[PDB]
Amino acid sequence: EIEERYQALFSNAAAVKALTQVVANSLGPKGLDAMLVDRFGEVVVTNDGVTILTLMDAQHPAARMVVNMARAQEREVGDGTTTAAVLAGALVSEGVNQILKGVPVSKVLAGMNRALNHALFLIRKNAIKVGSITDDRLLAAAKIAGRGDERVAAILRDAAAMLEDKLQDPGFKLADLVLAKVGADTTLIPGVVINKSPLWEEGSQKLQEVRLLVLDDGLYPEEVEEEALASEAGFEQYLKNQKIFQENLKKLKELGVKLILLTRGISDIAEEFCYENEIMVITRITQKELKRVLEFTGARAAKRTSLNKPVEELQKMLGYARTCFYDSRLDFTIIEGGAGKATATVLIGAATDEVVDEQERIAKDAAGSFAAAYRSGVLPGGGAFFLYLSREVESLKNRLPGMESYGVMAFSEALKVPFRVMAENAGFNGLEKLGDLMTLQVQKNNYALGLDFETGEFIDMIAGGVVDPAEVVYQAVKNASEVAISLLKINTII
Amino acid sequence: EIEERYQALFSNAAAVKALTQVVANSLGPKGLDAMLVDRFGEVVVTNDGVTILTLMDAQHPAARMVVNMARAQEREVGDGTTTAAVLAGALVSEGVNQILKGVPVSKVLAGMNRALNHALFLIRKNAIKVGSITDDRLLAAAKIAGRGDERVAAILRDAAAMLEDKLQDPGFKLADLVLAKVGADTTLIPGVVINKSPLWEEGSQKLQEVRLLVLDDGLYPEEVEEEALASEAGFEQYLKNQKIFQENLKKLKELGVKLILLTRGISDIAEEFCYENEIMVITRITQKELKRVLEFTGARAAKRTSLNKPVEELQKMLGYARTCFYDSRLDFTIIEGGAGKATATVLIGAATDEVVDEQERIAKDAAGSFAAAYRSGVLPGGGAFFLYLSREVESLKNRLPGMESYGVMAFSEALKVPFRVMAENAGFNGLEKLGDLMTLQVQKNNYALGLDFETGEFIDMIAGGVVDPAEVVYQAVKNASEVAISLLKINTII
Amino acid sequence: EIEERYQALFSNAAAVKALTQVVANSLGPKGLDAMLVDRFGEVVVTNDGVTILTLMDAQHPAARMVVNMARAQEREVGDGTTTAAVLAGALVSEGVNQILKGVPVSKVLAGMNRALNHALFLIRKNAIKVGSITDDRLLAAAKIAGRGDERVAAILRDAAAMLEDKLQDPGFKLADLVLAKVGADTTLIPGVVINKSPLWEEGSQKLQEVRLLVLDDGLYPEEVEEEALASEAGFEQYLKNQKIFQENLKKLKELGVKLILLTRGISDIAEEFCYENEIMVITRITQKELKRVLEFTGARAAKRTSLNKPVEELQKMLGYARTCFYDSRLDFTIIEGGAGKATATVLIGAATDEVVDEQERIAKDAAGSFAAAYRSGVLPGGGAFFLYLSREVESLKNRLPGMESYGVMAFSEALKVPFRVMAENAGFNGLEKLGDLMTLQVQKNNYALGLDFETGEFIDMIAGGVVDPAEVVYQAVKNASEVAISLLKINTII
Ligand SMILES: Nc1ncnc2c1ncn2[C@@H]1O[C@H](COP(=O)(O)OP(=O)(O)O)[C@@H](O)[C@H]1O
Ligand SMILES: Nc1ncnc2c1ncn2[C@@H]1O[C@H](COP(=O)(O)OP(=O)(O)O)[C@@H](O)[C@H]1O
Ligand SMILES: Nc1ncnc2c1ncn2[C@@H]1O[C@H](COP(=O)(O)OP(=O)(O)O)[C@@H](O)[C@H]1O
Numbered sequence A, B, C: 001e002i003e004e005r006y007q008a009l010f011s012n013a014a015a016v017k018a019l020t021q022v023v024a025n026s027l028g029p030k031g032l033d034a035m036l037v038d039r040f041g042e043v044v045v046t047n048d049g050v051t052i053l054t055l056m057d058a059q060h061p062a063a064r065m066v067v068n069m070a071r072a073q074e075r076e077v078g079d080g081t082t083t084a085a086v087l088a089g090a091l092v093s094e095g096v097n098q099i100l101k102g103v104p105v106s107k108v109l110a111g112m113n114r115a116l117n118h119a120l121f122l123i124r125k126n127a128i129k130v131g132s133i134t135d136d137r138l139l140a141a142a143k144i145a146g147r148g149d150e151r152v153a154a155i156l157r158d159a160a161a162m163l164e165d166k167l168q169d170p171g172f173k174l175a176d177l178v179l180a181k182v183g184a185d186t187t188l189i190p191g192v193v194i195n196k197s198p199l200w201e202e203g204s205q206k207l208q209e210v211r212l213l214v215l216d217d218g219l220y221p222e223e224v225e226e227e228a229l230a231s232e233a234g235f236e237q238y239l240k241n242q243k244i245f246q247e248n249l250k251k252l253k254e255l256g257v258k259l260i261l262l263t264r265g266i267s268d269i270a271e272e273f274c275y276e277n278e279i280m281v282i283t284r285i286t287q288k289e290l291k292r293v294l295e296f297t298g299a300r301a302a303k304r305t306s307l308n309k310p311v312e313e314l315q316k317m318l319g320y321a322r323t324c325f326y327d328s329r330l331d332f333t334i335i336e337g338g339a340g341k342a343t344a345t346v347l348i349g350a351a352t353d354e355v356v357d358e359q360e361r362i363a364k365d366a367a368g369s370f371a372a373a374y375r376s377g378v379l380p381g382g383g384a385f386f387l388y389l390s391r392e393v394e395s396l397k398n399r400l401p402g403m404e405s406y407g408v409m410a411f412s413e414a415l416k417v418p419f420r421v422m423a424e425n426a427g428f429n430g431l432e433k434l435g436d437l438m439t440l441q442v443q444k445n446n447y448a449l450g451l452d453f454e455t456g457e458f459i460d461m462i463a464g465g466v467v468d469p470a471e472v473v474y475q476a477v478k479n480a481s482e483v484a485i486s487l488l489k490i491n492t493i494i
Helices: A004-026 A049-055 A061-074 A081-101 A105-126 A136-146 A150-162 A226-230 A233-255 A268-276 A287-297 A355-376 A385-398 A404-414 A417-425 A430-442 A470-488 B004-026 B049-055 B061-074 B081-101 B105-126 B136-146 B150-162 B233-254 B268-276 B287-297 B359-375 B385-398 B404-425 B430-444 B470-488 C007-026 C049-055 C061-074 C081-101 C105-126 C136-146 C150-162 C233-254 C268-276 C287-297 C355-376 C385-394 C405-425 C430-442 C470-488
Strands: A034-038 A042-046 A178-182 A187-189 A192-194 A205-208 A212-214 A259-261 A280-282 A323-327 A332-336 A345-350 A378-380 A449-451 A458-460 A467-469 A490-493 B033-038 B042-046 B178-182 B187-189 B192-194 B205-208 B212-214 B259-261 B280-282 B321-327 B332-338 B345-350 B378-380 B449-451 B458-460 B467-469 C034-038 C042-046 C178-182 C187-189 C191-194 C205-208 C211-215 C257-261 C280-282 C323-327 C332-336 C345-350 C378-380 C449-451 C458-460 C467-469
Touching: A004 A034, A004 A049, A004 A061, A004 A081, A004 A417, A004 A470, A004 A490, A034 A049, A042 A049, A049 A061, A049 A081, A061 A081, A061 A470, A061 B042, A081 A105, A081 A404, A081 A417, A081 A470, A105 A385, A105 A404, A105 A470, A136 A150, A136 A355, A136 A378, A136 A467, A150 A187, A150 A345, A150 A355, A178 A355, A192 A287, A192 A345, A212 A287, A226 A233, A233 A268, A268 A280, A287 A332, A345 A355, A355 A467, A355 A470, A378 A470, A385 A404, A385 A417, A385 A430, A385 C430, A404 C430, A417 A430, A417 A449, A430 A449, A430 A458, A430 C405, A467 A470, A490 B004, B004 B033, B004 B049, B004 B061, B004 B081, B004 B404, B004 B470, B033 B049, B042 B049, B049 B061, B049 B081, B061 B081, B061 B470, B081 B105, B081 B404, B081 B470, B105 B385, B105 B404, B105 B470, B136 B150, B136 B359, B136 B378, B136 B467, B150 B187, B150 B345, B150 B359, B178 B359, B192 B287, B192 B345, B212 B287, B233 B268, B268 B280, B287 B321, B287 B332, B345 B359, B359 B467, B359 B470, B378 B470, B385 B404, B385 B430, B404 B430, B404 B449, B430 B449, B430 B458, B467 B470, C007 C034, C007 C049, C007 C061, C007 C081, C007 C405, C034 C049, C042 C049, C049 C061, C049 C081, C061 C081, C061 C470, C081 C105, C081 C405, C081 C470, C105 C385, C105 C405, C105 C470, C136 C150, C136 C355, C136 C378, C136 C467, C150 C187, C150 C345, C150 C355, C178 C355, C191 C287, C191 C345, C211 C287, C233 C268, C287 C332, C345 C355, C355 C467, C355 C470, C378 C470, C385 C405, C385 C430, C405 C430, C405 C449, C430 C449, C430 C458, C467 C470
Parallel strands: A178 A345, A212 A259, A259 A280, A490 B033, B178 B345, B212 B259, B259 B280, C178 C345, C211 C257, C257 C280
Antiparallel strands: A034 A042, A187 A345, A192 A332, A205 A323, A323 A332, A378 A467, A449 A458, B033 B042, B187 B345, B192 B332, B205 B321, B321 B332, B378 B467, B449 B458, C034 C042, C187 C345, C191 C332, C205 C323, C323 C332, C378 C467, C449 C458
């Protein structure tokens, strides 16, 4: 009859475990996978964790409170979300075990934050900063998210090299430098690209000294309500506007415009006019492509209505853009020599329109990895650094008194969880390889020793081309710990 | 068959306890959060008790009769609600023990009232007056109820020091003098502020001898019914009201106006007029800001119809307000040098627009506390003074006869409950620490000893910078006692 | 159907655990008692472990095999059996936990052995040897086993001073030099004593230069079969034997004998003869008294046939024994100044012939304790050294490879068990006290800090006058370890 006082806590834990016990199947390079079902019998097989974190039917409030945290992680990295997830769940489950033994909650948390703060603090000092831009460690940082095609790693690396100065700019994501096209040849372009064919085509074509205008709109004349097409006067507005459209066309041919970019379609009047005035134009671009060409050229976003300015303000919304080339043998457009910022574009080849959507995603995780690796610093992957963390946390067991000492230890052993799982995924005896490795680390005084989950032999992870970005690990730990804490702060349910 | 006679009592008690066992979790510096659910599956995690009191499905008459009390105190105090709640539940629970043991109900209540009265008298007599409006005890009094935040303490101290004169007016609450701004800097301002930019902005600008008028409205021309605009007379009348509009605008430019304040919009014609006459304008301000500037400048609130006043009685409804300055690099407006009373304004800095609504919640708890701190009367917090109360109540056990004597005793032990819970919230053995402290107070004869619920060693709460205001505890006790009384006077249910 | 392969393990474990869970209640100075039943409805309340180990109806093979260990240590030491019992049971439980976790058996035990060896190594090396025999640490070593009779301690240490040289023969027990007697005065006697009144009363009487003969027999004439009294020749041989008996009596009166010692009865002729020759005699003494006086006087044991010796072996078969005194007002006899071995005699006072039997029980364990304390040296009691052991064993957690490391840890935490129990017997939060003491010990680097299970204050145990003998702890740990080891090698039950 004493169960109620501890009811709620368990009520949460059982749920949390039930979640992580699933994602654990998919963790690590030789992770497994999970199969989700919607009531309509829809079937999905994911091997990536985040997908499963998103799609799994988990209505339990706790699980939700883990999911929100997962969302809080995907916003910052793209890789190593599964890590903080599993870590959270373990911290919860094996965390509560000490509370059940008789250690009161608040005094558990009290030691746990100590463990956390200390963990981060040591991550800071141990975050291996590069001091280079050519380092192989970065290339590998892209490789692991890259899944190991050093081609992608190389081109992304060279690309980031070309723009090292704006790697200091928080208003910049490297992931944006990638657009993939089917059957292309994996390479780099020192400018911005638009994956489209121009309005009228007659083979690969090039223009120089490009005066261009960009529009977040389409090229039709100004509209008035539809009912007004039955009022004759509205018709007079129609003819008048028909005049002012062409007038504005001449206003464009006045300033020497030779190129036009639109997000929609084009009127026949415009098509004919352009056909006559040697001005090239491309339609239906992405709002993101819009943003990129806008930033690169230094132009101003314009629409239909901004045609009424008197040619004097026209020189204020234009673009340049040193050179421009459309390839018919490759079916796309290249803009180079912008007078704004200097973004490039990395293109990746594909087979069908299937892989073509994933290649850029891999590019995103790669570039993001590289970005945080160059910015933040690297820690050894393989879950190996978590072990150094583990023992160096366990150390506080007897440096600070109180029952807090227990909580700390709970934290400590929890940090051991990742590696084992990976190993136990790759088919190893988790305990043998964990104990052997954790013993090995001390007897070699190296926190970088870990396991190649393919051979079975232990190697140096940095030399294995296996590392993680500092901030990724840092904020993974940071969020996961706090969601755990704020989960065990729960006492009751109504 | 005599179990029936007491039925109702349990029906209430069992409910009451079941409620309070939750709120105790929220008491004290290391309280535990609770997880509430609405039947639609709505989820919430709260840590302060008052929040928890509301979503909890408690249709039970007793529970309702406690909720009403808590809500009734937060309406009248603001701090120490969790406390009086728990205390009430305790008086009920430890109250019934004597009734079941064999003490008749009325004879319980009768002594309980006596215990109450004595408690009150002792709170009054032992209430520590400040006599130094600058005293550190007050600053701390703002700190612990606030959340610490030594900035707020400082600014509040400066505010109360510069304005000690209005601590004698009971028709005034200090807490409303706080407004927070995103990215601002926690400081004190000797005037009234509006956190928005005036009608035309460029740089930080200041004007002197400010002629301002206040309006609980906006600057548009006079409106007429939509049907009445279909009578032709409505159009020319529209011209007419526009006429009286222009007349009144010129009537404004007559008086030397340099500033305008509105709670609504502005006519473009009017805006043109103001732009033409070097007149500054602010729109859609807070009504609280309205009232504050109204008091500060000594002006009178007026609206559009009072524009027909003949410029000479209009000159009496105006304001000044010696100086007024808008800062554009911080985005707000400050008015100082009113010729009426001289109220100030406390400014609090923030990170984002999320936290921006929460700091006022600490500020209200802070300032209000300080407000009650000069008014009162400081007592040691930590629930530490309650034990002195307890024992000094137990003293009456054998100086007064009757079975009434029993009721009193119950009362005494009830007072011990808060501290106890605090301890077992902080993860200490409540009975042990209570036992140690209650002896310790006698062996040092100071009612100021309590326990640091973080370290574990006992200190003077005054020396810990941790105290509570008198009046809050006074009516907290009075109310909790009174609801307990009206709860145990219950015999039956129909 | 795969559960059947682990059946035996729990089948034993549950038993061992259930036993030690009982004996633990009684462990330590504030241990509790248990109420044992014989089927006849006989009731027993025990507080000492050994009693409980003996009377408890525990037929389960494992439990029996623990009883065997208790029997095996109490027989070889006398103190510190309860400890090794509890420790054993703990080793069992925390042993199985890792198997349940997944650590395979053999790879656990193999290293557990390493843990043992290192533990022993620490017991040897850290044993503070005395080198002074007068050291207070020894007096205390007797004190803790003594139940707090500084008299017993003092007299024992002074006695040991008298025999520091003969403490080296293991064919000697110091505990035997103590016998307690009703209404006596707790003191030391420089000889061997016999607590009986001789066949002669005269008042307190003293004799010197005693030429004495010792007999593992009685003073009867030579006996002949009752049937042989039907053979006539037996009558005259009986008379002749009656003659030779008195003849040898004269042979005794020849030698200047003044004292006679018998283990059986006395013939009437012998009795009269003895009365006539001023010779004092006592009958039916203890065999232990027999051997000790045999060692002391240097006399030789004799029987019936050795009356036929030709006046030649009598001068060598006698005893001496310089002085001898019988006190009738204290009711016993004292022999001092022997030319043989040099045993002394410690006498302790008592109330009735009941307490006189428990007093000797305190005396034997006391003397034994002191014996091993001088024999090997002392280690700190209070279960305090087991924690040092715990940590210094834990040091091997990452020092040794293999899946084995984990097993070591179990060992470590097992060593933590005693203190906790002690504390939780004394009514403290065991875990809290561990958390405080285990840290306190490291940051002060002394393995001698522990807890006074009365106050709550921590003290130095050697400075607290509370210690254990080295060899005792050594072989206690050794035994518990070996029984645990030999218990977990069990696979099945048939
Ligand atoms: N190819 C690999 N070799 C060794 N370790 C790996 C490899 N890939 C991933 N890991 C380890 O798995 C963990 C998570 O990898 P990550 O790329 O972040 O996947 P996720 O984003 O699913 O967590 C990291 O700690 C990393 O060290
Ligand atoms: N740091 C602290 N030191 C000492 N006492 C404290 C501390 N924090 C809180 N307390 C005590 O605990 C109680 C805090 O709860 P309270 O502020 O009344 O909750 P609420 O404001 O929701 O009513 C107060 O009675 C105060 O005396
Ligand atoms: N007054 C005391 N202060 C500190 N420690 C004590 C005190 N009394 C007993 N102990 C400790 O309690 C334990 C007593 O158990 P023990 O005498 O070994 O039981 P047994 O000898 O029957 O196994 C010893 O380790 C001793 O150090």
